[PDB]
Amino acid sequence: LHHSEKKYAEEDQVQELLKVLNEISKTTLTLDPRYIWRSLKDLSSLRNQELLNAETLCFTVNVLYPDSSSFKKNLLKFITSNHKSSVPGSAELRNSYPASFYSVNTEKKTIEVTAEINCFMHLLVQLFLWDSKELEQLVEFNRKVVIPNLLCYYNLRSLNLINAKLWFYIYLSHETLARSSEEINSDNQNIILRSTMMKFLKIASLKHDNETKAMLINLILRDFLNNGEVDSASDFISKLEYPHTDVSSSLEARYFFYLSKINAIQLDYSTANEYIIAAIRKAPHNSKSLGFLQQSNKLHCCIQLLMGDIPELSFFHQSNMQKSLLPYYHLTKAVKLGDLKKFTSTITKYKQLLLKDDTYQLCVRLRSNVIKTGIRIISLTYKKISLRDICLKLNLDSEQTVEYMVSRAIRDGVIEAKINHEDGFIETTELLNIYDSEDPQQVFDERIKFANQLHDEYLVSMRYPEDKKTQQNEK
Amino acid sequence: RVPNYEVSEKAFLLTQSKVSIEQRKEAAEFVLAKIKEEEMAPYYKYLCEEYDQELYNELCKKNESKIKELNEKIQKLEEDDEGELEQAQAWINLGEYYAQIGDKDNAEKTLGKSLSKAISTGAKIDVMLTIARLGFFYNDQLYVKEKLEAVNSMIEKGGDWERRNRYKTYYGIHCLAVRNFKEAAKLLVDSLATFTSIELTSYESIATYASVTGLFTLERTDLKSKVIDSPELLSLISTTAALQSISSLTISLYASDYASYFPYLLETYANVLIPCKYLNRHADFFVREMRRKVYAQLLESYKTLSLKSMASAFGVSVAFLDNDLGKFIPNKQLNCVIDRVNGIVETNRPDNKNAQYHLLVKQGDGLLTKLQKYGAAVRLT
Amino acid sequence: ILDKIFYGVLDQGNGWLYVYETPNQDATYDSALELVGQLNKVVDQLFEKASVLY
C-alpha cells in the first residue's frame, strides 16, 4: 500500500529527472530540457493526488538534502506530522552508478552534483504548496529561503530558464494571501517583493535569457497598474528589452494586454487598438486561455467606444461568451443613439459587475462619448444642419452649449466640420477625391513593407530544423 | 404525411393575437375538427399552451389500433416469404401512422428499420425526404438542415432525376427559412418550371415565396424578366389573397407609381409577411430594404430633389419622411444628405476613383491577417 | 436614366438637366479584385495541407 505507492510515484520522477540531468551536462542543449519542463509541471500536478503525497519525502531522503529535508519537514508539520517510517534513511536507491549520483564520492565532497538538483527540488515544493493551497506561514517561509539560494548561485543559461519559473509562483502566492485578508504585514512584505525582481532583472539581461526576461517584465507591469503608478510604467516600457525571439505566444499576449491599458488612460486610443487586436492573435484560443480571451474582448470593446467608434454589433451576439458582454451591448446602444438618460441608467445597473475589473472607472469617462458620437452621426446624415435641429433630435440643452461641444471636437478633428455662426448652420467639409491627393501612396507604401517583413520571417526560421537533420545520420 | 403542415399553418393564426379576432376564430373552426380527426395531441400539446382526453383515448386507441394493425401485419409478412421487401413496406406503414399523429420521434425509428433492409434505391430517397418534411412541420430550422444533408448524400448516388425536382423545393424552404435570401430566390423560381409532387405541400406556396424573394434580391432589369414576365405567375393570375397583395406591390414599383406604393407596403405586411411562419421572422428585414430601394432608384435619377417633392410623391409628410431617411442614411446604400437649411435633398452617390479604391483595400486586409496567423505558429513549432 | 442610354441628373430643386456620357472606370482595379479573391481561398488550403506538423 503505502510503501509500494511512495516508491512507484518516485520512480517516474527520477526518469523525468535523468533526462533533464543528462541533457544539461552534455553540452548546452538549453532549448530541449525547457520543452521537457513545460510538460513536467503538468504531468506532476496530475501525479500528486494519486500514489500518496509523501512520495516527495522519499525522494528528498533518497538523494542529497542540503536544506530541503528541513523544508519538506515544515510542509509535513503544517498539515499535521505524518508517520509511517517517514524518518530519514527511509529511502536510498543511489547504488554507485554515476548516473544516479556516485554514493561514496558525493558524500565525501570530492565531487558536487547537488547544484541543479536543489533548484529542481525547490520547483517541486512550490508547485506542491500551491497545489495543496498551503498559504500563511509557508508562503513567507518559502520566499525567505529561495531568494538567497539563487543569489548564491551563478546560474548558467540553462539554470536561468529554471528559476524563471519559481519567480512566477513567488508573485502569485503573495497576491492570493493578500486578497484573502488585508493586513499591514502583507503591506511591509510587498515592498520586499518589488525590490527582489528589480535586482534580479539586471543579472538576467546579461545572460540574455529570452525565457527569464519575458517572465519578469509581465509581472512587473502588472504590479504597477495595481498600485496605479503611471510614471514608473512608462519608463519601464521605454527600454523594450522584452524579447520576441523565441518566447511563447502566451507570454506575448499578456505583454500586449497591459500596453493596451496603459496607452488607453494616457489618451492614445489609436495605439491601444492595435495592441488589443495583437494580444488576441498571439493568445491560443484554448479553455486554459479562456480567462485571457474573456478579459481581452471586454477591453477591446471599451477602446472602440473611447475612440468614438461603435465596434461590430455582431461581436457581442455571435460570441458564446455573450452573457458577460450583456453590459457591453447596453453601453453600445446608448452611445450610438446619443440617449443621455439611457447611458447613465446602464452603468448604475451593471455597476457592481463593472467595478470588479475597474472598467467602472473607464465608464465614467465614456459619458463624454455618448454625446460626441451622436453628433458625428447627425453631421454625416445632414451636411448643413442648423444648430436648432441638432438640439431638438438629441434633446441637447441649448444652441450655445452644443456649439461649444462641436467646436471642441473639430480642434481634435474628429467631426471634420466647421461652424458658420453668421449663417446659422454647421457645414461638413468632406468632398472625397482623396485618391487624387498623395495620401493613398503613404498608405500603400506601408503595406509593401509589411509583406516584406513576412518573407524575412519565413526565410530565417525555415532553415533552423534542416541543420539538425543534415548533421543527424539518416538511413 | 400531407395534413401535418395544413394543421400547423391554421394553428399559427390561432396562436397569434396579432391577427384580427374575426380571422382568428375562422382559423379556430377549421383546425378543431382536424385535431380530433388526424389525432394530433403530441404536437397539439405544445400549441395549446402556446396559443379532450377523448383525443387521447382516441390517440391511444388509434395508437394501439393503428399501432397493433401494423405490428401483426409485419408479424404476418415476416412469415410470408419475401424477407427484404415485404417487411420493409410494412415498417414504412408504421411510420406513415407516426407521421400522421405528428410524432416525429417514432417516425424515425420505424423508417430506420426500413432503410436497413436493402430495397428499391428510389424508395430510400423518398424516405430520407419524408424525415426532412418533419423538420418543416415543427418549423425547427436546425432539424431541416441536418436531415437534408443525408438526402443529398443519397440523391447523387441514386442519380434520381425525379426526386431531384423535390430537392429544389425543400432546399428552397431552408434558405427561405433562414435570412439569407440570395440562395432562396434562385431555387424557388426554378421549381415553378419543374414540379414533381409525391406527397407534397401545395404549388400555391411556391408562387408566394418566389415573389417575395424575387423582390428582395434581384435588381431592376432582372426583376422584369424573372418575376413580372414569369409566365406561371401570370397564368395562375391573382386568385388567392396572399398572392394578390404582393402582386400589386410588384407592379407599382416597376410602373413607378409612387402614390399607391406606400399603401401597398402596409397591405403586404398585414396579409403576406405576418400569416407566413417562415417569413414572419423576416417581415422586418424585407420592408427595410424595399423602402431603401424606391429611394435608391429615385436619387439615381435626381441630383436634387425638394423635401416636399420627394415626400408628396409617395404620399407621406415631410416630417415623417425626414425621420425615415436619417435611419437609412448611415447604412450607405442611399449616399445622400438632407440640407435642412436649403430644403433640398442633394445626392453624393460616389462612384469615383476613390470609391473603387476602398473596395479592394478591404479585401487585402483580410488576406493580411491570415498570413501572420499561419506563419507565426508554424515558425514556433 | 435607369435603362441607361444618357445617364444624367434631373434637378427638382431648380430645373436643369445635366448630361454625362462618361463610361466606365478602371478595368485595373476590377481584375485586381479577382486575383485577391483567388488568393484568399488558396492560403486557407495551404494551411490545411500544412497541418501534418500539428
Binding site: 525555415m462 530544423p465 534542416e466 537533420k469 545520420n473 539518416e474 538511413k475 | 508554424v378 | 495541407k49 501534418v52
Partner: peptide, 27 residues
Amino acid sequence: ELMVIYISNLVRSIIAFDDLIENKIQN
C-alpha cells in the same frame, strides 16, 4: 516553401531516430 520544407524535416526526424534504435538491436 516555408511549410514544404518543414514537412520534409518532419519525416526525416523519424528516419534518423529509427537508425539509432536499429543499430542497437542488431549489435
